[PDB]
Amino acid sequence: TGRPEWIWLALGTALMGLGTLYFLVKGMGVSDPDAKKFYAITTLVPAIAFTMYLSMLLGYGLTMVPFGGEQNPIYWARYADWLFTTPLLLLDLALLVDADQGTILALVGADGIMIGTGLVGALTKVYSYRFVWWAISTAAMLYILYVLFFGFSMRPEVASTFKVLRNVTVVLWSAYPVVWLIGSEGAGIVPLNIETLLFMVLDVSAKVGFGLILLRSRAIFG
Amino acid sequence: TGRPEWIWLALGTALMGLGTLYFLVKGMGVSDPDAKKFYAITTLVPAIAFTMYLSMLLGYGLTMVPFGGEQNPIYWARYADWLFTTPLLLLDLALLVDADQGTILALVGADGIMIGTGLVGALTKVYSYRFVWWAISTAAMLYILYVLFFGFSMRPEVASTFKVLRNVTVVLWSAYPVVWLIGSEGAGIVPLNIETLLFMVLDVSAKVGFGLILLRSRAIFG
Amino acid sequence: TGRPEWIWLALGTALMGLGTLYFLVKGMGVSDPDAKKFYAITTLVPAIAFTMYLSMLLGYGLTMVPFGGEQNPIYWARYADWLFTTPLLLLDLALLVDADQGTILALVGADGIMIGTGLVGALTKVYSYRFVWWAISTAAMLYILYVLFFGFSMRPEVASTFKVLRNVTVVLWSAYPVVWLIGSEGAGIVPLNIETLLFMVLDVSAKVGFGLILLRSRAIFG
Ligand SMILES: *C/C=C(C)/C=C/C=C(C)/C=C/C1=C(C)CCCC1(C)C
Ligand SMILES: *C/C=C(C)/C=C/C=C(C)/C=C/C1=C(C)CCCC1(C)C
Ligand SMILES: *C/C=C(C)/C=C/C=C(C)/C=C/C1=C(C)CCCC1(C)C
């Protein structure tokens, strides 16, 4: 299409589609109820991302937001994705370590706040206020990372896989607020097409990369 | 009103209203926690459907979608209904057979995908792409039906009621993609008023019919 | 700002912000998984309310709804708040008394209905029909209050705290339909700025007041 970022939306669509079918095939067989849990969560994440990448690709998940006196192309479908996929990702971590329900409700709700205030910031028409919402969302993100490091003595295999995915998570998720801040939603330093490339690489790694690590682990079986 | 389909929206409103009050009365009494579960789920389904039928009846759940160069009347409130009532229906089936949580999360999330891509398809302004979303949604539907048949040795009474509702479910839910495809959201072969009649008959059967079968069964008690 | 109600939106923002940080600090320490549950729920409630008060304050959570041939300023962000915070409040009550899951699903779903039909009523452009949605929502509210009084012999300490919060809940929640009815969403008897003051006082009491009562109780510990 006439949108230079179309290629990264097409590649993301394809890669999420392929990871979904890979994980669906892979989880064929599985009878351990525990493993079943991780397969369901982990397959749903890129299936949802597939649909929202495709909706961006076809033009549906894009809207024009006037701010700084200009019509800014905002991809809102990313927040409908993340709204569901980022808690699912947290549930995978949480189940690995047998978290208490209170800690899981803390994580999912901080996550909701993170994404929803990101969305409000994305659609806010007063430029300066966009970054107030960014800050609040970032603070929710930092709470989540805090809990992942300080909020949890288990089978060695659980701990090891949990520690790797936790590290993957902090590194990748921490990049999203930066991208947003310097990209088209924020200061407009980085053009939309490079931004969309950046988010494609992060999303595939955080979903399909993460899930390959998890689902090859015997940490997921009782 | 000046909408010929108004009569089927009024009858659906009434029938869902009546089934809700019937099931509410009926579940009066119930102390078995298990039965309580099925009554809550099963009463909520047509109560939600009541509200969305009424919102269509009064004009609120209808929007104009330009496509094939025309203003197409799309009832979006059906997807707000289904978004909640179709997972609830799946939960009823799932609890009957004591499904593993992983299988329940698979079903609810495939269902979310089904309805949400149905909604995107319903509101898409590029005619051809409407049917890409239809296909993806249908494939989610076929996954759900697959799991209901191949994803689950229990008390004979559970199995029997489970098998009847499962059959009811596959037959009725399978008709929805057809109706959408030949009706006003899709190829426009069947006029909106007949379409609305068709969806009224399916919805009442899938909700109030289904629930009468379930809630008369002693399969719902421990 | 040029909106007279701005001061009560600023004070509500501040008070919800402060209660969130108070409860977050307070729950620092807590290891009892049960207590952890109540802290998560109870801290999330005013954190969510903080974000929606701030979105009203900045103008984002406000839209113009034409009815009775006039552009009525409707704060829709209250329903995005309540959609999540009112079930959370019910979950706090429900967990205190060890409710059956069927009763919890009844409460959360009646609550969803309550808020969602409130939202539909708030955005309905046919004046008379606004109050049909009000009535349906009120009837959901009365079901919830009914269940809180007649739907539940435990540790004396649980019962006592449960009875106080239950009383707090019925009194405060019952005022909301009245405010809506006489205020800008309804009959327009009470100006928007006084209405916004009223909702600020109720919300802070129902969230931050309620939570102070709960989280000082040893009813929350196993
Ligand atoms: C599947 C995609 C994932 C794991 C995406 C994660 C997204 C975030 C961690 C987003 C964070 C943001 C903030 C902390 C600040 C404001 C903007 C956001 C929403 C991009
Ligand atoms: C209470 C109403 C029920 C049980 C409705 C079920 C609706 C479906 C099974 C819808 C399926 C659709 C597709 C598979 C394709 C695209 C359009 C839909 C959403 C009508
Ligand atoms: C945190 C805020 C709380 C506890 C707010 C509760 C709101 C209600 C109980 C709202 C009830 C309403 C009706 C019963 C009728 C129509 C309008 C509503 C949504 C204001």
Side-chain angles (χ1 to χ4, degrees):
Chain A
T1 101
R3 290 175 284 130
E5 67 272 18
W6 80 264
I7 172 59
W8 321 115
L9 302 176
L11 224 213
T13 295
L15 298 165
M16 289 300 184
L18 279 57
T20 298
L21 300 164
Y22 181 65
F23 294 149
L24 257 173
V25 188
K26 201 167 178 310
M28 301 195 76
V30 195
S31 92
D32 181 71
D34 271 68
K36 266 160 157 173
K37 283 190 245 171
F38 291 112
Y39 273 98
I41 299 169
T42 304
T43 299
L44 278 163
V45 163
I48 293 156
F50 165 75
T51 66
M52 298 295 96
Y53 266 88
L54 171 75
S55 86
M56 291 187 287
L57 179 65
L58 302 186
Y60 184 84
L62 173 75
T63 197
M64 301 302 277
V65 181
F67 62 82
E70 8 246 77
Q71 295 247 104
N72 311 269
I74 299 294
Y75 285 104
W76 62 262
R78 321 203 187 255
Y79 310 90
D81 177 338
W82 297 345
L83 169 71
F84 298 103
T85 53
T86 54
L88 280 169
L89 285 160
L90 292 178
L91 230 214
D92 267 340
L93 299 175
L95 287 182
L96 228 33
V97 314
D98 183 22
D100 282 325
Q101 291 168 204
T103 307
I104 304 167
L105 182 33
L107 281 169
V108 174
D111 195 290
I113 287 169
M114 182 180 72
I115 303 306
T117 49
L119 177 55
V120 173
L123 301 178
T124 284
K125 301 187 239 209
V126 179
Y127 188 61
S128 298
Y129 294 171
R130 291 182 76 85
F131 306 98
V132 173
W133 297 109
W134 177 91
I136 290 147
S137 177
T138 290
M141 190 190 68
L142 297 175
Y143 178 74
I144 287 160
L145 308 182
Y146 172 69
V147 169
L148 297 177
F149 282 104
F150 298 88
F152 305 129
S153 190
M154 43 220 156
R155 21 215 271 245
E157 16 160 342
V158 164
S160 180
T161 290
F162 166 72
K163 285 185 201 109
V164 177
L165 297 177
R166 174 181 55 208
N167 289 339
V168 169
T169 294
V170 175
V171 175
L172 300 170
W173 290 35
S174 293
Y176 285 79
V178 181
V179 175
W180 190 109
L181 181 63
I182 65 204
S184 54
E185 271 84 76
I189 290 167
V190 168
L192 176 50
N193 79 118
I194 299 291
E195 163 167 29
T196 300
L197 165 65
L198 298 174
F199 274 136
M200 189 249 287
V201 181
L202 295 167
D203 285 340
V204 170
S205 307
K207 303 191 155 72
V208 184
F210 176 107
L212 287 166
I213 297 154
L214 177 67
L215 295 182
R216 313 282 236 110
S217 171
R218 207 74 145 117
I220 70 196
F221 285 86
Chain B
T1 101
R3 290 175 284 130
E5 67 272 18
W6 80 264
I7 172 59
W8 321 115
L9 302 176
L11 224 213
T13 295
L15 298 165
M16 289 300 184
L18 279 57
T20 298
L21 300 164
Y22 181 65
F23 294 149
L24 257 173
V25 188
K26 201 167 178 310
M28 301 195 76
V30 195
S31 92
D32 181 71
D34 271 68
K36 266 160 157 173
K37 283 190 245 171
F38 291 112
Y39 273 98
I41 299 169
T42 304
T43 299
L44 278 163
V45 163
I48 293 156
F50 165 75
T51 66
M52 298 295 96
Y53 266 88
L54 171 75
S55 86
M56 291 187 287
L57 179 65
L58 302 186
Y60 184 84
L62 173 75
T63 197
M64 301 302 277
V65 181
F67 62 82
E70 8 246 77
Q71 295 247 104
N72 311 269
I74 299 294
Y75 285 104
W76 62 262
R78 321 203 187 255
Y79 310 90
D81 177 338
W82 297 345
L83 169 71
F84 298 103
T85 53
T86 54
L88 280 169
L89 285 160
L90 292 178
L91 230 214
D92 267 340
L93 299 175
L95 287 182
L96 228 33
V97 314
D98 183 22
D100 282 325
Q101 291 168 204
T103 307
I104 304 167
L105 182 33
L107 281 169
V108 174
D111 195 290
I113 287 169
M114 182 180 72
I115 303 306
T117 49
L119 177 55
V120 173
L123 301 178
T124 284
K125 301 187 239 209
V126 179
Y127 188 61
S128 298
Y129 294 171
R130 291 182 76 85
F131 306 98
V132 173
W133 297 109
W134 177 91
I136 290 147
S137 177
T138 290
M141 190 190 68
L142 297 175
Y143 178 74
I144 287 160
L145 308 182
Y146 172 69
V147 169
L148 297 177
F149 282 104
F150 298 88
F152 305 129
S153 190
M154 43 220 156
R155 21 215 271 245
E157 16 160 342
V158 164
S160 180
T161 290
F162 166 72
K163 285 185 201 109
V164 177
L165 297 177
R166 174 181 55 208
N167 289 339
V168 169
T169 294
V170 175
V171 175
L172 300 170
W173 290 35
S174 293
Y176 285 79
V178 181
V179 175
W180 190 109
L181 181 63
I182 65 204
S184 54
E185 271 84 76
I189 290 167
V190 168
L192 176 50
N193 79 118
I194 299 291
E195 163 167 29
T196 300
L197 165 65
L198 298 174
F199 274 136
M200 189 249 287
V201 181
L202 295 167
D203 285 340
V204 170
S205 307
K207 303 191 155 72
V208 184
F210 176 107
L212 287 166
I213 297 154
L214 177 67
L215 295 182
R216 313 282 236 110
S217 171
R218 207 74 145 117
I220 70 196
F221 285 86
Chain C
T1 101
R3 290 175 284 130
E5 67 272 18
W6 80 264
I7 172 59
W8 321 115
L9 302 176
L11 224 213
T13 295
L15 298 165
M16 289 300 184
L18 279 57
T20 298
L21 300 164
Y22 181 65
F23 294 149
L24 257 173
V25 188
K26 201 167 178 310
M28 301 195 76
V30 195
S31 92
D32 181 71
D34 271 68
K36 266 160 157 173
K37 283 190 245 171
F38 291 112
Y39 273 98
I41 299 169
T42 304
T43 299
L44 278 163
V45 163
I48 293 156
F50 165 75
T51 66
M52 298 295 96
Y53 266 88
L54 171 75
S55 86
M56 291 187 287
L57 179 65
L58 302 186
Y60 184 84
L62 173 75
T63 197
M64 301 302 277
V65 181
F67 62 82
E70 8 246 77
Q71 295 247 104
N72 311 269
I74 299 294
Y75 285 104
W76 62 262
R78 321 203 187 255
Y79 310 90
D81 177 338
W82 297 345
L83 169 71
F84 298 103
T85 53
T86 54
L88 280 169
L89 285 160
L90 292 178
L91 230 214
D92 267 340
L93 299 175
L95 287 182
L96 228 33
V97 314
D98 183 22
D100 282 325
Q101 291 168 204
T103 307
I104 304 167
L105 182 33
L107 281 169
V108 174
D111 195 290
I113 287 169
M114 182 180 72
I115 303 306
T117 49
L119 177 55
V120 173
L123 301 178
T124 284
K125 301 187 239 209
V126 179
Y127 188 61
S128 298
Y129 294 171
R130 291 182 76 85
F131 306 98
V132 173
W133 297 109
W134 177 91
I136 290 147
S137 177
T138 290
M141 190 190 68
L142 297 175
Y143 178 74
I144 287 160
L145 308 182
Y146 172 69
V147 169
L148 297 177
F149 282 104
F150 298 88
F152 305 129
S153 190
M154 43 220 156
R155 21 215 271 245
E157 16 160 342
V158 164
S160 180
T161 290
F162 166 72
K163 285 185 201 109
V164 177
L165 297 177
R166 174 181 55 208
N167 289 339
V168 169
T169 294
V170 175
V171 175
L172 300 170
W173 290 35
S174 293
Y176 285 79
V178 181
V179 175
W180 190 109
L181 181 63
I182 65 204
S184 54
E185 271 84 76
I189 290 167
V190 168
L192 176 50
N193 79 118
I194 299 291
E195 163 167 29
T196 300
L197 165 65
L198 298 174
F199 274 136
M200 189 249 287
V201 181
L202 295 167
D203 285 340
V204 170
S205 307
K207 303 191 155 72
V208 184
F210 176 107
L212 287 166
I213 297 154
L214 177 67
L215 295 182
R216 313 282 236 110
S217 171
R218 207 74 145 117
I220 70 196
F221 285 86

